[PDB]
Design an enzyme around this catalytic site. Structure first.
Site, PDB file in Angstrom:
ATOM      1  N   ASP A  58       0.164  -2.648 -13.554  1.00 45.11           N
ATOM      2  CA  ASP A  58       0.482  -2.375 -12.201  1.00 45.11           C
ATOM      3  C   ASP A  58      -0.772  -1.433 -11.577  1.00 45.11           C
ATOM      4  OD1 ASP A  58       3.227  -3.290 -11.622  1.00 45.11           O
ATOM      5  OD2 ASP A  58       3.816  -2.273 -12.773  1.00 45.11           O
ATOM      6  N   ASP A 107       8.522  -0.199 -13.962  1.00 43.35           N
ATOM      7  CA  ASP A 107       9.145   0.992 -13.879  1.00 43.35           C
ATOM      8  C   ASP A 107      10.718   0.682 -13.564  1.00 43.35           C
ATOM      9  OD1 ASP A 107       9.824   3.738 -12.583  1.00 43.35           O
ATOM     10  OD2 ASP A 107       7.425   3.437 -12.951  1.00 43.35           O
ATOM     11  N   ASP A 150      11.857  -4.725 -13.437  1.00 49.58           N
ATOM     12  CA  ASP A 150      10.938  -4.643 -14.333  1.00 49.58           C
ATOM     13  C   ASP A 150      11.391  -5.375 -15.752  1.00 49.58           C
ATOM     14  OD1 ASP A 150       8.943  -4.672 -12.178  1.00 49.58           O
ATOM     15  OD2 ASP A 150       9.082  -2.884 -12.605  1.00 49.58           O
TER      16      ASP A 150
HETATM   17  N1  LIG Z   1       5.123  -7.647   1.972  1.00 56.66           N
HETATM   18  C1  LIG Z   1       4.623  -6.947   2.775  1.00 56.66           C
HETATM   19  N2  LIG Z   1       4.173  -6.405   3.339  1.00 56.66           N
HETATM   20  C2  LIG Z   1       3.976  -5.222   3.958  1.00 56.66           C
HETATM   21  N3  LIG Z   1       3.553  -4.704   2.748  1.00 56.66           N
HETATM   22  C3  LIG Z   1       4.048  -4.367   1.569  1.00 56.66           C
HETATM   23  C4  LIG Z   1       5.091  -5.564   1.252  1.00 56.66           C
HETATM   24  N4  LIG Z   1       4.974  -5.523   0.200  1.00 56.66           N
HETATM   25  C5  LIG Z   1       4.554  -4.604  -0.401  1.00 56.66           C
HETATM   26  N5  LIG Z   1       3.927  -3.580   0.315  1.00 56.66           N
HETATM   27  C6  LIG Z   1       3.384  -2.370   0.814  1.00 56.66           C
HETATM   28  O1  LIG Z   1       2.818  -1.990  -0.837  1.00 56.66           O
HETATM   29  C7  LIG Z   1       2.836   0.103  -0.429  1.00 56.66           C
HETATM   30  C8  LIG Z   1       3.602  -0.252  -1.987  1.00 56.66           C
HETATM   31  O2  LIG Z   1       3.108  -0.568  -2.482  1.00 56.66           O
HETATM   32  P1  LIG Z   1       2.220  -0.593  -4.754  1.00 56.66           P
HETATM   33  O3  LIG Z   1       1.549   0.514  -3.762  1.00 56.66           O
HETATM   34  O4  LIG Z   1       1.489  -1.167  -4.325  1.00 56.66           O
HETATM   35  O5  LIG Z   1       3.206   0.144  -5.505  1.00 56.66           O
HETATM   36  P2  LIG Z   1       4.694   0.542  -5.190  1.00 56.66           P
HETATM   37  O6  LIG Z   1       4.224   1.928  -4.561  1.00 56.66           O
HETATM   38  O7  LIG Z   1       5.450   0.052  -4.347  1.00 56.66           O
HETATM   39  O8  LIG Z   1       5.257   2.087  -6.223  1.00 56.66           O
HETATM   40  P3  LIG Z   1       5.464   1.343  -8.036  1.00 56.66           P
HETATM   41  O9  LIG Z   1       4.366   0.081  -8.223  1.00 56.66           O
HETATM   42  O10 LIG Z   1       6.887   0.648  -8.672  1.00 56.66           O
HETATM   43  O11 LIG Z   1       4.509   2.289  -8.830  1.00 56.66           O
HETATM   44  C9  LIG Z   1       3.860   0.170   0.481  1.00 56.66           C
HETATM   45  O12 LIG Z   1       3.454   1.479   0.985  1.00 56.66           O
HETATM   46  C10 LIG Z   1       3.632   0.776   2.770  1.00 56.66           C
HETATM   47  O13 LIG Z   1       3.564  -1.103   2.903  1.00 56.66           O
HETATM   48  C11 LIG Z   1       3.249  -1.294   1.606  1.00 56.66           C
HETATM   49  C12 LIG Z   1       4.856   1.012   3.142  1.00 56.66           C
HETATM   50  N6  LIG Z   1       6.437   0.319   3.229  1.00 56.66           N
HETATM   51  O14 LIG Z   1       7.074   1.416   3.196  1.00 56.66           O
HETATM   52  O15 LIG Z   1       6.256   0.017   1.850  1.00 56.66           O
HETATM   53  C13 LIG Z   1       4.514   1.282   5.107  1.00 56.66           C
HETATM   54  C14 LIG Z   1       3.723   1.772   4.957  1.00 56.66           C
HETATM   55  N7  LIG Z   1       3.403   2.876   6.424  1.00 56.66           N
HETATM   56  O16 LIG Z   1       2.450   3.353   7.765  1.00 56.66           O
HETATM   57  O17 LIG Z   1       4.501   3.447   6.776  1.00 56.66           O
HETATM   58  C15 LIG Z   1       2.133   1.591   4.937  1.00 56.66           C
HETATM   59  C16 LIG Z   1       2.189   0.910   4.085  1.00 56.66           C
HETATM   60  N8  LIG Z   1       0.579   0.736   2.739  1.00 56.66           N
HETATM   61  O18 LIG Z   1      -0.107   0.987   4.046  1.00 56.66           O
HETATM   62  O19 LIG Z   1       0.149  -0.355   2.240  1.00 56.66           O
END
Ligand SMILES: Nc1ncnc2c1ncn2[C@@H]1O[C@H](COP(=O)(O)OP(=O)(O)OP(=O)(O)O)[C@H]2OC3(O[C@H]21)C([N+](=O)[O-])=CC(=[N+]([O-])O)C=C3[N+](=O)[O-]
Ligand SMILES: CCCc1c([C@H]2CCCCN2CCN2CCOCC2)[nH]c2cc(OC(F)(F)F)ccc12
Ligand SMILES: [K+]
EC number: 7.2.2.10
Length: 994
Positions: free
Chosen positions: A351, A703, A707
């Site tokens: 990851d 995590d 997973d």
């Molecule tokens: N299908 C999708 N469409 C759009 N985005 C996706 C999608 N799938 C995943 N993501 C985005 O990716 C961020 C999380 O993915 P990533 O950083 O790779 O891994 P994780 O945080 O999930 O935890 P982990 O990998 O288990 O350790 C999220 O933050 C955000 O939008 C999310 C997020 N969110 O709520 O999840 C909110 C946000 N704002 O501004 O509110 C901005 C993001 N961003 O900018 O990437």
């Protein structure tokens, strides 16, 4: 009812035929219970003590040894153990080890943790329901909950079943779904149906998942599924199917032991074909009790010689020493046999966030529209210093540390960051500085609010306690936050609705503040913002805005971009349905752009080089992230998975792209793909399976408790030192520091382990192949037993098990990581490598035959009858008057036996150094390199002399001491073996290639 997230709240109550007001009748509970069973994961059917003992004695080699004590025991009652009370010891010691080994095989199991049992924490004991027989709520046992039940939850409660929500009796409802994903942000729930029936769980905004906790509020709902049909229950049956295979070494040992058994029997039949000459003997005279015992005493002696009986503890110690050694390197190995597989990894799926990157985001760039005059466009690009969440840092317009409040567009860009934000900061005094309070992306915004100090508030007299919540605060004082339209992934944005303080600093009514993915937000923008003025969004500005976004998100900066916008004339508050996320994007239309922020989740320091180590070690690394594919590929170029100018169109896919492929072209992707962006947990197992289809040993990070299936399906499931407990207990390794370079460091030590296990496995198997020779000569020529089994056991455990458990401490190689990963189907012995140890094995077998028979046919204390073929020992009856020029009972004597047992020890300490390199000589590689090995060779000798002197031992072993000179013909015979393999080594060095 598995589709209840796509059915209307009335459609579910209709399906079950239940009244939300009544609940299930007592009769309805009866029927649903029999049809759906109880609400519990299946009680695991584990093993018992009586079965474990049979497991320890079902193994072929312990079976062959177990039989070898049911023959030695017969030959103790049926042998005069009164003239030698040291007779009943040979059958007794064999059992003592199968007993000890059986004991070791079970305390390796009482401690073993089941990953499925860790799921059963998320089974709460109780739960509240509403049914017909009572009007008040009933706190009944969770396992007794049935689908179609009307169920209530509130704060602190653990959700006991997969639940469709009916009415949310609170102003809001928030849920902590961290057990599933490992995240840390409560999610808002609604009640409108979710259209897509095949939709993922993060989009099931109306479902309550069994095992997750209620963060805020109180709501009512109907139960969709129970037991194994829930989301977490759907995962238990995924691990219950996972056939985790044996480590390669285990298959080698299984194949070796399978061959070692068929080889032992091959020789037993051969012996009977040599003493098929004793088939021409008279019926009388020859005691068949004396002949049959001879064959059986030779068989119980033969089996001991072949089986490496110290190797089970030699290996399980060498692994446990690297386990402690890796714990200092932050690698926490959970499964002992995995220290070997850890070095055979060829693919490493890791990851991105947390392990490859530091998960410490902060905004680096930002821009506003500076001028819109016709096709001419002007941006006001800035930059921000500071990598921690600390208000330390400043804005720089072309490196002028500008006062942010000077630009009016920067003040609107900052109010969005502070208000459109469910994250904040706080003075941390446990550790000295600051810590994120919320989401990493939103906290990076609040930190940006502080560095800007957009209103030039007090900055001199700021206590580093009430800091970090200062310019944020002075902004929350102006506009009152009315409600928040949370981030959903359909529209990829969130928004807050705000009224002013209604005092003398009021404005034009209310405002909406929007932030999200650039493309979506920018499309809904019909106007822009130039300081405080406003212009229609025109073609050029859109192209210029998006162009910089691709520069920032795709270029060498590798930035995550957020387009900030505000709606100036939002709908009136009474006209917004806040129970439907599908209507939120409509509410966020007709916006005006104000700016874009660019933040970086920076790669770790040690990560940049660990990728290159994997290149040198032929290990393919695959990144997995949630960044958009454009930025995913951007970060891969930054760390070294890709080259800055290398085409990767068919080497990087998203979740949507990977499924649009037919199963055939999916398999070929994983062979070449080095990056996946925005995938589903269902893909981590699919990728492993395809990587397995190429016989590739795969490492996989994870995590959550989703997973866990991929962690199990992978050959080396790697968990986080901060992950949920289930992920750890479902892993073969836990990174104590959540760092990727730890993985590479672990793969290094796994090779240093095997590259030394290579030697002592070959070296003990060489001595066994050597001892089996010694028995076969003492059998064909019918010599008095030159090695009794009790002596052979001491050798194959102590006098050999200390040199063997020192070659593990050999010098690690320099090119140890410049060689590609080792192959699984790499055979045990090469054609040459087998032939080499057979020559050495043949020698040491014909040297213990020396000392324990050269004590005749050329001896001083012994008979020394070299002319007359002695051979016949207990064969002699009255054939000794003048035919045997002396007596007839020192054939058996603890004086020749103590000579072979003596020479074998010295011989096997010599081979303990030929197995220090493999092909290079001692002219080049001297024994000065493994001083741990040297200082131990003396100990086995001091024990060899301990069994040649101290009170009871010499009689126990049927051995007596040597002479201060009898060591003459021990070293005259033993030491030559060094040159023997040194001769075989010059064959490969200067006169063999591959
Ligand atoms: N299908 C999708 N469409 C759009 N985005 C996706 C999608 N799938 C995943 N993501 C985005 O990716 C961020 C999380 O993915 P990533 O950083 O790779 O891994 P994780 O945080 O999930 O935890 P982990 O990998 O288990 O350790 C999220 O933050 C955000 O939008 C999310 C997020 N969110 O709520 O999840 C909110 C946000 N704002 O501004 O509110 C901005 C993001 N961003 O900018 O990437
Ligand atoms: C390591 C050499 C082969 C060997 C095996 C193989 C045969 C094929 C099936 C797999 N086992 C390995 C599993 N065993 C189970 C018992 O605990 C130790 C690990 N089983 C031995 C038993 C020995 O007993 C003894 F006490 F002597 F150590 C010695 C060598 C082997
Ligand atoms: K696994």
């Amino acid at each position: 009812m598995e589709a209840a997230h796509s059915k209307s709240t009335e459609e579910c109550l209709a399906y079950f035929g239940v009244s939300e007001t009544t609940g299930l009748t007592p009769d309805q509970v009866k029927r649903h219970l029999e049809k759906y069973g109880h609400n519990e994961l299946p009680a695991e059917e584990g093993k018992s003590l009586w079965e474990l003992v049979i497991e320890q004695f079902e193994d072929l080699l312990v079976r062959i040894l177990l039989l070898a004590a049911c023959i030695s025991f017969v030959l103790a009652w049926f042998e005069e153990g009164e003239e030698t009370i040291t007779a009943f010891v040979e059958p007794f010691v064999i059992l003592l080890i199968l007993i000890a080994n059986a004991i070791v095989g079970v305390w390796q199991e009482r401690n073993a943790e089941n990953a499925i049992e860790a799921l059963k924490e998320y089974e709460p004991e109780m739960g509240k329901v509403y049914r017909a027989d009572r009007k008040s709520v009933q706190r009944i046992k969770a396992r007794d909950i049935v689908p179609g039940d009307i169920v209530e939850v509130a704060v602190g409660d653990k959700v006991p079943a997969d639940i469709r929500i009916l009415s949310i009796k609170s102003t809001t409802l928030r849920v902590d779904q961290s057990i599933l994903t490992g995240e840390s942000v409560s999610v808002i729930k609604h009640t409108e149906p979710v259209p897509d029936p095949r939709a993922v769980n993060q989009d099931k905004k109306n479902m309550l998942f069994s095992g997750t906790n209620i963060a805020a509020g109180k709501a009512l709902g109907i139960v969709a599924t129970t037991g194994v049909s829930t989301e977490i229950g759907k995962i238990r049956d995924q691990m219950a199917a996972t056939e985790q295979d044996k480590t390669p070494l285990q298959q080698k040992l299984d194949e070796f032991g399978e061959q070692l058994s068929k080889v032992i029997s091959l020789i037993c039949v051969a012996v009977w074909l040599i003493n098929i000459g004793h088939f021409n003997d008279p019926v009388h005279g020859g005691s068949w009790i004396r002949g049959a015992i001879y064959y059986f005493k030779i068989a119980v002696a033969l089996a001991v010689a072949a089986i490496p009986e110290g190797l089970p503890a030699v290996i399980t110690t060498c692994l446990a020493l690297g386990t402690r050694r890796m714990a200092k390197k932050n690698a926490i190995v959970r499964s002992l046999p995995s220290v070997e597989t850890l070095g055979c990894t060829s693919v490493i799926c890791s990851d991105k966030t947390g392990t490859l990157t530091t998960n410490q985001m902060s905004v680096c760039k930002m821009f506003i529209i500076d001028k819109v005059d016709g096709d001419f466009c002007s941006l006001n690009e800035f930059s921000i210093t500071g990598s921690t969440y600390a208000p330390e840092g400043e804005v720089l317009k072309n490196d002028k540390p500008i006062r942010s409040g000077q630009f009016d567009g920067l003040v609107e860009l900052a109010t969005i960051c502070a208000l459109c934000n469910d994250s904040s900061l706080d003075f941390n005094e446990t550790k000295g500085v600051y810590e994120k309070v919320g989401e990493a992306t939103e906290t990076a915004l609040t930190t940006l609010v502080e560095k800007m100090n957009v209103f030039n508030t007090e900055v001199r007299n700021l206590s580093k306690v009430e800091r970090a919540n200062a310019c944020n605060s002075v902004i929350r004082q102006l506009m009152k936050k009315e409600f928040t339209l949370e981030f959903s992934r359909d529209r990829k944005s969130m928004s807050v609705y705000c009224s002013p303080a209604k005092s003398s600093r009021a404005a034009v009514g209310n405002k909406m503040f929007v932030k999200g993915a650039p493309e979506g937000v920018i499309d809904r923008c019909n106007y822009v913002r130039v300081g405080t003025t406003r212009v229609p969004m025109t073609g050029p500005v859109k192209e210029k805005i998006l162009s910089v976004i691709k520069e920032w998100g795709t270029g060498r900066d590798t930035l995550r971009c957020l387009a900030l916008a505000t709606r100036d004339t939002p709908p009136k508050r009474e006209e917004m349905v806040l129970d439907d996320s599908s209507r939120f994007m409509e509410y966020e239309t007709d916006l005006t752009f104000v700016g874009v922020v660019g933040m970086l989740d920076p790669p770790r320091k040690e990560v940049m080089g660990s990728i290159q180590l994997c290149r040198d070690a032929g290990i393919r690394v695959i990144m997995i992230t949630g960044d958009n594919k454009g930025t995913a590929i951007a970060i891969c170029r930054r760390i070294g998975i890709f080259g800055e100018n290398e085409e990767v169109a068919d080497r990087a896919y998203t979740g949507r792209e990977f499924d649009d492929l037919p199963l055939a072209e999916q398999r070929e992707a994983c062979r070449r793909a080095c990056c996946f962006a925005r995938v589903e947990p269902s893909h981590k197992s699919k990728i492993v399976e395809y990587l397995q289809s190429y016989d590739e040993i795969t490492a996989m990070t994870g995590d959550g408790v989703n997973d866990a299936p991929a962690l199990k399906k992978a050959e080396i499931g790697i968990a986080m030192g901060s992950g949920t407990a289930v992920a750890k207990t479902a892993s073969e390794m836990v990174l104590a520091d959540d760092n990727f370079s730890t993985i590479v460091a672990a793969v290094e030590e796994g090779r240093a382990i095997y590259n030394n296990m290579k030697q002592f496995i070959r070296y003990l198997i060489s001595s066994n192949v050597g001892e089996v020779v010694c028995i076969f000569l003492t059998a064909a020529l019918g010599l008095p037993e030159a090695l009794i089994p009790v002596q052979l056991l001491w050798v194959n455990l102590v006098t050999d098990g200390l040199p063997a458990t020192a070659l593990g401490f050999n010098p690690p190689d320099l090119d140890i990581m410049d060689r590609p990963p080792r192959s699984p189907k790499e055979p045990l012995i090469s054609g040459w490598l087998f032939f080499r140890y057979m020559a050495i094995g043949g020698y040491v077998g014909a040297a213990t035959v020396g000392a324990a028979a050269w004590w005749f046919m050329y001896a001083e204390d012994g008979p020394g009858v070299t002319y007359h073929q002695l051979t016949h020992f207990m064969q002699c009856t009255e054939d000794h008057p003048h035919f045997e020029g002396l007596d007839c009972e020192i054939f058996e004597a603890p004086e020749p036996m103590t000579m072979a047992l003596s020479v074998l020890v010295t011989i096997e300490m010599c081979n303990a150094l030929n197995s220090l390199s493999e092909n290079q000589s001692l002219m080049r590689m001297p024994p000065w390199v493994n001083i741990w090995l040297l200082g131990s060779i003396c100990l086995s000798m001091s024990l060899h002399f301990l069994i040649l002197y101290v009170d009871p031992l010499p009689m126990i072993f049927k051995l007596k001491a040597l002479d201060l000179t009898q060591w003459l013909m021990v070293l005259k015979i033993s030491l030559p073996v060094i040159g023997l393999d040194e001769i075989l080594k010059f064959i490969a060095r200067n006169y063999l290639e591959g």
